[PDB]
Design a protein around this nucleic acid. Sequence first.
RNA 1: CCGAACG
RNA 2: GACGAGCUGAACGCGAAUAUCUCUUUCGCCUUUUACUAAAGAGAUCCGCGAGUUUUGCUCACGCAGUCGCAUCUUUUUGUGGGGCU
Lengths: 99, 100, 198, 88, 99, 60, 170, 65, 90
Amino acid sequence: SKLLQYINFRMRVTLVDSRQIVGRFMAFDRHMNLVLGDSEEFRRLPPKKGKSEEEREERRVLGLVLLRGEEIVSLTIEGPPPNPGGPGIGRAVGRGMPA
Amino acid sequence: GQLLTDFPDRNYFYLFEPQAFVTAKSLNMCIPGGPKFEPLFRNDINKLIIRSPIRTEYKVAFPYLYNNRPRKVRLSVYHHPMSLYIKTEDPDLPAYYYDP
Amino acid sequence: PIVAPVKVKKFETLEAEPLRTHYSNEFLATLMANPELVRNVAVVGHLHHGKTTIMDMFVEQTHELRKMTAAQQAAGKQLRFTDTRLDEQARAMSIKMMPMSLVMESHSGKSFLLNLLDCPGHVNFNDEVTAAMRLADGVMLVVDAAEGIMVVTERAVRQALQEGLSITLMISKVDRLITELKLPPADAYHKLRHTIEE
Amino acid sequence: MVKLVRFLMKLANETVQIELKNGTVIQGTIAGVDIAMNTHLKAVKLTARGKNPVSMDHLSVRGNNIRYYILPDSLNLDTLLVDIDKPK
Amino acid sequence: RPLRFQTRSTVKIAAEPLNPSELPKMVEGLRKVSKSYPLCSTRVEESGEHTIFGTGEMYLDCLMKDLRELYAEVEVKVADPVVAFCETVVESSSLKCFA
Amino acid sequence: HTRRAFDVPLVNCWFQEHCPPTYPVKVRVSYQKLLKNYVLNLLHARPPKSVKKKYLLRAL
Amino acid sequence: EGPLCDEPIRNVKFKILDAAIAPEPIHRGGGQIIPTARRVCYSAFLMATPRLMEPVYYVEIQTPADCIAAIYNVLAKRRGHVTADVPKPGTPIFIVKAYLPVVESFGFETDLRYHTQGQAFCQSVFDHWQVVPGDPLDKSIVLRPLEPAPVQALAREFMVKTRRRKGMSD
Amino acid sequence: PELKRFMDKKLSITLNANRHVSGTLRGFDQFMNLVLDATVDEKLKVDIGMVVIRGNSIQTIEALE
Amino acid sequence: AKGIGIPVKLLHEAEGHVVTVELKSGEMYRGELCDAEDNMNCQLKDVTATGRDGRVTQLAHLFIRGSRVRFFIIPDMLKNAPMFKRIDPK
RNA sequence: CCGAACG
RNA sequence: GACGAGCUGAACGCGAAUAUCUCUUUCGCCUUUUACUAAAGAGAUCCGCGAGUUUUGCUCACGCAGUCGCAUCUUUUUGUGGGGCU
Ligand SMILES: Nc1nc2c(ncn2[C@@H]2O[C@H](COP(=O)(O)OP(=O)(O)OP(=O)(O)O)[C@@H](O)[C@H]2O)c(=O)[nH]1
Ligand SMILES: [Mg+2]
Ligand SMILES: [Mg+2]
């Protein structure tokens, strides 16, 4: 798979119930199982008019999580992965002169 | 084979391997069918008991138990496990066979 | 000497850095901190019946020591990992029991940390045995397929039941059935069955 | 070996659309489809149910939650339709 | 509870360091021998000599080897080996003995 | 590996397959001396050290 | 310790029948009877026909049929009781049960290998005690230095040389 | 399967659409069909006798012991 | 074994620890997993049930069908599995 | 064990 | 995601074969020295030996090639849908 290009790369997951999971990639199974390090659940609360959609999505911290593909719907990238000497000598020598 | 005459086991030479002879020379005592070696270096009766003689295969089979002043020796009579192989003779019997 | 030589004090010469294994340091550090993935086992048998070599095969499958093996079959001797003291070595004998816990694999893929304690099997070293046996709650009795039961086997078996242990049978050296004795497969079944029955 | 995932895995570098099971819309380029119908897309924009579009440099979508594919109008279908009966 | 062996140190040997000038390290050797050999037993008599107690041939053999090279480095003369004699009754005494 | 023909000992087995009691005295003495040198060349082969070669006939 | 060899007293009953005690505690501390208790032990056992005891190695000898006889031969020289010679099921080796005393085990594995050319290999473990033959306190036999005594004089000279080493008179 | 460790034990088996049946186990399959003795519907308070439940008809099982 | 992907053997080596189980229904299950299946059916003990309404309940044992389960929460201690380290670039 | 040179 | 026989060079290293020499000592031959004996040690040498690319000398040989940038019944990719309450 090309998600071998994607282990250690931080990623976000959508569930069928539309809950959000953000963690970093460790190991993947054929069944679309995933291993999320440093995972946290962003669950979308309904948008109460007068507030930004971006500023109150409920974050829970799950820790290390593993994801069963059956309810795995969509995956995206979130960010980057988090963080002869040779036979030469030089010696001082005058230059010889012919006279 | 007729020149080899027959095979050796690691078995047979329990006091005939080199180690036998190292223990031999280090104690100035030599196997009965074993060779000579001149010295490397150069006891109360009422209180000490003899029920059987300290023999030379004895001091040769445990050099530090049975000998005062043993030195320069490698190890002693340690035995290889017994070998339950006997020459199958005739090529007609099965490869795998019970020995009587 | 008047100037005493500064000698390598050749007692039992080990290696100068923790070796390469198929697991990490912190992986074993993990598997230690929870009792449900650790098994303590002493390994006992008669003299020579395969104990040291089985421990060595474990080492060979769970570590990184191949060029060691090349040095072994080039020099003409088979490896003895737990027989470390180069005087216990040169007698082809385990002299004093030595411990080792290896992170080994299950069929489930769940790695268990197994504390195997390679013991001497020669009778006059039973002392070592009891130590390891009061150390470990389980025991592996390695009885060699060829010669059946011997003294130290069943004496360590009494040691094993007296200290209330999980006794586990390892029929070692099955190839001596095939190659030395050449007993057919059926008589091999009879002999193996008879050894576990004994 | 079904005919149709046999057809779908040759959609490599196809700039196509996708409908999800719950009603999300995705327009992007197929970098790969595999035997499980799971697709990894490039040059993507995903627009959720009632949501603003958000663009993705790359995207992964499970074969099972796929509702359907919208293929290019420029498609030589009968090119990719041959060989589907061929076992390799 | 201490180790309750199956075996007993039934064999005994005498030990006299060839040089008495090194009987301390000798016993320290013996002492350090009493370090590594669970069945090793060091016993001093009215005779004053240190008798050492082992299972038999190989155990006393290798304890004498490690005493010679591992701990003391003092080479020691060991007499002929001899074992421990218990003292039993045949049938009960015919008179009651007082003290 | 192939050996040098004179490296190969051909009477070594006669020191392993051990003496039958049928050995005249001279043959027993000679067997004993041969088996002594045998166990000795076995044992104390002092591996000297690897100072590096000349190869006379290659140079010549 | 005990009186015969100051080696452990075994298989001995000490029955208290009488103690005429002084009534007040200071007449009957440890310093008054601890020697006296040891002296009553010494005396009460001494006149009870006291006998000496050996350890007996449980000797198990695996051996081919080729060597059975020499097994018996050397242990017969060393007073060992062979218990049986069980033919091993499935192999051509016979296990051999024997009881050979630990005294008589001195150099035994060696000589057993030596008169068998080594096809046999035996093991010995401590098995039990049993009584040294003869009369251990005896004087009716005045014995040889440097030569072994017969069966009839063992128990005698054995505790004798015991005492002589341990620092006691005969 | 670990259902083997449950043999002949009183259980609480939850099923699809929030249903509980509680009965001493009698046996299971590879498809995790379950046969129960003296099973009780915890909704309507009815002991429903010996039952078989389907595999995907098993959300969870708890052991009251 | 041959054929089996890494994360389920992760689940297996998680044996003997206390973990968390989220199923597709949304309730949380914290307990000591005894052992689990190829099909992610698992048995925990010392079970804390966190229902959809915050309900906290005590269950002695739990057998969880895997295709009922959404994800697992596992100690980062065990994220030191030999797969994790071995695959790792360093 | 065991033989050559020299003085 | 992939290919050697023979020689001389490699620079690193001592399965089973072992002879000679030097030195420091003891011992024995014993008039002396060589030439020796046999013990202890400490040192050399010889005759050989294995792997890495260096190619010299093929007299062999090659490129749509063996390999490329798990495939529908209760346990997995053929999901239980629909609505609506704070
Ligand atoms: N035929 C055969 N010989 C084996 C086998 N395993 C080990 N051996 C041999 O048996 C010898 C003795 O086994 P060891 O490895 O010493 O095992 P041990 O029984 O612990 O021996 P001690 O160390 O004396 O206790 C080894 O040197 C091997 O040659 C086996 O499977 N078959
Ligand atoms: Mg002159
Ligand atoms: Mg002159």
